[PDB]
Write a protein that binds this ligand. Structure first.
Ligand SMILES: Nc1nc2c([C@@H]3N[C@H](COP(=O)(O)O)[C@@H](O)[C@H]3O)c[nH]c2c(=O)[nH]1
Ligand SMILES: Nc1nc2c([C@@H]3N[C@H](COP(=O)(O)O)[C@@H](O)[C@H]3O)c[nH]c2c(=O)[nH]1
Lengths: 217, 223
């Protein structure tokens, strides 16, 4: 169980630990984990009965199985902790799956930083695991690229977080674990220059803290 | 308390779930997590007293801090689950750290041994004079880690370079390689579960098992 309060300095404390960079708590670890496990059950219920291209028996179509698993593409770096937890819940619900990774970045225009290494996704069910949908530009770019380069049977998106008010392009993920306020979030994979990703809870960031670490790593 | 049993087919069952690909149980989730958390305390206790190059203020040397954190390089794809768990324990013990990834792959070839390639480079570019810790899944022959250490040292010139492995298979060594931190020791068998794979299968298991002999060729098709 968690205790969420503010100390005498007005700083958020969760389970005895102070978070002076946080404006508000969004979700505790318990709430996050319950939300991910609930979505894992939805993903397993949706994909378990489906069939797709048989690459194990070089055959036609066959059920999702350890021979022909659901293909999961995890988006680095923000989704790796979420992915590690989600795959264990998907295993709990008995969904056969395998995970590869891609990474994208913006210069705002989008560019691939790291490509997936899976090469046989034609006619396969593919699920993207991503940390958050905000404007929707990052996921529109990933979906268009995976669709044209891999030609999957179906392509869906599961996000840990949906920031509804940030949308600038049409993008509604098929699966959403949590809804967050229209603010910059940190914790549980969410970072400020790679800091704060290890927090077990999600918080909104005090606006003055966003440029605290300007030096490139 | 986990319930470990065998069904009428002789298959290992842990908490009601059957593992027909497994020969024996090595470690339950409870044992694995306790072992990782213990090593996280050792890592935090070792690094929090240290200092390294100040890139935040452009001074000389400064203590490990959120301004100048420990640099962790995680080896993809094998270490991502271990890394996700370890970083949360390191945060519990108050160790300032950041994580970047290197991706290495092994391919079946025409030569005597499977061949290694670097698929993804680190994105971090200011590791000179920094304390760097590598997080890796297992040390068996030691060849993979010797390759990674040499590369990281030559390209980044770190102040110090150490290795933490989830698993040590001591009886598989072919080259000198002793990790600085070891969470658990595994039998001289092919292990699966908790990140350990057969062609990307079995990584999601909460427990570590030994693989039934010959089952490493169960999924021959390239993904
Ligand atoms: N830490 C933190 N990252 C993001 C992002 C990052 N930008 C991308 C998503 O943005 P978008 O949908 O606008 O294209 C992702 O790479 C995500 O990691 C959006 N919003 C936040 C937020 O509130 N907090
Ligand atoms: N699933 C599973 N992988 C490996 C490996 C693989 N080879 C790498 C390390 O090998 P080595 O030390 O022999 O160079 C590991 O990162 C992993 O990919 C060795 N032993 C095992 C094992 O018992 N089980």
């Amino acid at each position: 169980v968690h205790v969420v309060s503010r100390n005498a300095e007005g700083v958020i404390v969760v389970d005895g630990k102070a978070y002076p960079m946080a404006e508000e708590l969004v979700a505790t670890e318990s709430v996050i984990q319950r939300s991910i496990k609930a979505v894992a059950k939805q993903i397993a219920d949706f994909y378990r009965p489906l069939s797709h291209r048989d690459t194990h028996g070089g055959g036609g179509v066959a059920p999702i199985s350890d021979e022909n698993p659901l293909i999961i593409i995890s988006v680095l770096k923000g989704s790796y902790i979420f992915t590690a937890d989600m795959v264990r819940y998907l295993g709990d619900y008995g969904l056969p799956h395998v995970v590869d990774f891609l990474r994208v970045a913006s210069y705002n225009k989008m560019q691939l930083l790291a490509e997936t290494q899976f090469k046989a996704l034609r006619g396969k069910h593919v699920l993207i695991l991503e940390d958050i949908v905000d404007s929707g530009k990052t996921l529109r770019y990933i979906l268009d690229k995976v669709q044209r380069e891999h030609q999957p049977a179906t392509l869906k998106v599961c996000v840990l977080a949906d920031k509804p008010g940030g949308r600038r392009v049409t993008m509604q993920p098929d699966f959403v674990c949590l809804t967050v306020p229209n603010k910059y979030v940190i914790g549980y994979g969410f970072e400020v220059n790679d800091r704060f990703r290890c927090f077990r809870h999600i918080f909104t960031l005090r606006p003055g803290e966003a440029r605290r670490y300007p030096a490139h790593l």
